[PDB]
């Protein structure tokens, strides 16, 4: 098949004409730092975790034992591979097993208004046969058509094994990919564009293979 599409790889979102402020209060929780030097704190019941807020630097009661700073510490899995996914161009798969709920990778790109993006669609993206636009917040999107990271190659499934979650990370919304279920080695990562992706209003046949496939992506 064809070569993978070109993009400018970035390590952090680029803010173009909007900045995705979360409006969250300063983060606080009631977690206690485990006396064991090597046990994690801020686990499932962390009051910050429960509102999709990451703990902030210097103020978490667990200190360096806090495990609720995954996005801000860029704690991405290191076992991802870009590969030819049959009938779906390029996709991303994991080379190691993943566990339900686990953080995988941040989705990066240019953060733009829906106005700027609809402008880019008419002027720059009208010829494209692959689309790269994630929803973020009211009126803003993450455009990875030109800059981003390898999460831009993750394909859609009507029966997805991953999902996007929107988190407040030190006052700004960021989007991460998280596993919905345990997945064995070699599994292609997928998420449901109907739930997470901007409606580019293009009809493309879905090849996810699900018994109850929606027929087209986002349908
Ligand atoms: C975010 S890109 C994913 C990477 C893309 N496959 C590539 O080769 O660059 C989304 C594009 O991938 C293709 N795609 C994603 N999921 C698909 C699916 N389930 N069935 C067919 N094509 C899919 C569509 O062309 C879609 O516009
Ligand atoms: N229902 C909401 C919704 C969500 C996403 C889409 C898409 C779509 C297709 C390919 C790529 C992308 C990306 N943003 S990457 C989005 C098309 N449509 C209309 C046709 O169904 C959608 C509708
Ligand atoms: Zn906590
Ligand atoms: Zn914490
Ligand atoms: Zn499908």
Query: Beta 190-191 vs 155-156: how paired, if at all?
Result: parallel
Domain hosting residue 9, numbered range:
1-219
- Going by alpha carbons, the residue nearest to atom 3 of ligand 1 is 153
Q: Could you give the CA distance from residue 41 to residue 134 in angstroms, rounded to a whole number? A: 31
Q: Are 104 and 191 in contact (CB under 8 A)?
A: no
Judge whether 56 and 145 are in contact, CB under 8 Å: no
164 CA to centre of ligand 3 in angstroms = 22
Residue 154's nearest CA partner among 124, 178, 136, 174 is: 178
- Technique employed here was X-ray
CB 110 within 8 A of CB 144: yes
Q: How many domains does the chain fold into?
A: 1
Q: Alpha helix (H) ranges present in 130-212?
A: 193-196
Q: Residue 135 Cα, ligand 2 centroid: separation in angstroms?
A: 11
132 CA: nearest ligand 2 atom: 15
Does residue 152 have its Cβ closer than 6 Å to ligand 1? yes
Question: In the numeric block, which tokens belong to residue 162?
Answer: 């991953």
Q: Tokens 């986002």 — which residue? A: 218
Question: Strand 110-113 relative to strand 140-143: parallel, antiparallel, unpaired?
Answer: antiparallel
Interacting residues of 196 by C-beta distance below 8 A, sequence separation 6+: 134, 135, 163, 164
Is-contact 156 197, C-beta < 8 A?
yes
- Stated in angstroms to one decimal place, the resolution of this structure is 1.7
């Amino acid at each position: 098949g064809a070569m993978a599409g070109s993009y400018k790889k970035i390590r952090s979102n680029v803010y173009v004409d909007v900045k995705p402020l979360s409006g969250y209060e300063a983060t606080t929780c009631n977690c206690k730092k485990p006396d064991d030097d090597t046990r994690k704190g801020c686990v499932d019941d962390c009051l910050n975790r429960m509102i999709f807020a990451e703990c902030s630097p210097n103020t978490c009661p667990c200190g360096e034992q806090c495990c609720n700073q995954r996005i801000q510490r860029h704690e991405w899995v290191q076992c991802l591979e870009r590969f030819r996914a049959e009938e779906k161009g390029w996709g991303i798969r994991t080379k190691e097993p993943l566990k339900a709920g686990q953080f995988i990778i941040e989705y990066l790109g240019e953060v733009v208004s829906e106005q700027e993006f609809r402008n880019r669609m008419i002027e720059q993206y009208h010829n494209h046969s692959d689309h790269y636009c994630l929803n973020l917040d009211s009126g803003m999107v993450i455009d990875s058509y030109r800059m981003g990271n390898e999460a831009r190659f993750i394909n859609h499934s009507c029966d997805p094994n991953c999902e996007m979650q929107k988190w407040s990370v030190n006052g700004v919304y960021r989007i991460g990919l998280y596993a919905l279920k345990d997945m064995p080695a070699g599994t292609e990562l997928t998420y449901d564009y109907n739930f997470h992706s901007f409606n580019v209003e293009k009809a493309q046949l879905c090849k996810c293979g699900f018994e109850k496939c929606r027929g087209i992506i986002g349908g």
